[PDB]
Amino acid sequence: APTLQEALDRKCAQFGKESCNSGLASYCGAAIYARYDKGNSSQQTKEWRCYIEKELDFSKSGDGCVDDCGSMTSCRGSVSGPSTSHLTRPSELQAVIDSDKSNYCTDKSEQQPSQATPPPEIP
């Protein structure tokens, strides 16, 4: 993974497609992503879970990702309705965040790099 959030997607590939390996048709050949968002209806409140693209909504801005450092950054892909094809491993996602932060972490170059990078403060 090039960035910390993708190491999450990678963590996600290890749980998600693990379920796929167990027979879960959903993750089977699916694109699974790490999204700190809501799960199933009864499984609300955002926690790091593994959501296959099936379950995310890219019409939702994913203010539940993590940037290169473990801070929740904004990137399109978030649970619109109750997510079914998902794995709540918030301990494990935030773990590779914590861990792979050694593989990617900036001193907060302002999360969500949409180019330009204008200083959000006037001295």
DSSP output for the chain: --SHHHHHHHHHHHHHHHHHHTT-TTTTT--EEEEEE--SGGG-S-EEEEEETTT-BTTS--TT---SSSS----S-B--S---SEE--HHHHHHHHHHHTTTS--S---SS--SS---SS--
CA 58 to chain centre: 13
The dihedral formed by the CA atoms of 66, 67, 68 and 71, expressed in degrees to the nearest 10: -60
Please give the residue range of the domain that contains residue 107.
Answer: 1-123
85 with 52: CB under 8 angstroms? Answer: yes
80 with 90: CB under 8 angstroms? Answer: no
CA 39 to chain centre: 12
Of 105, 77, 76, 89, the residue nearest 11 (C-alpha): 89
User: Position 37: which residue type?
Assistant: D
CATH number (domain holding residue 28)? 3.90.640.70
Count of domains forming the chain: 1
Spatial distance between the Cα atoms of 32 and 14, rounded to a whole number of angstroms: 9
Spatial distance between the Cα atoms of 117 and 111, rounded to a whole number of angstroms: 10
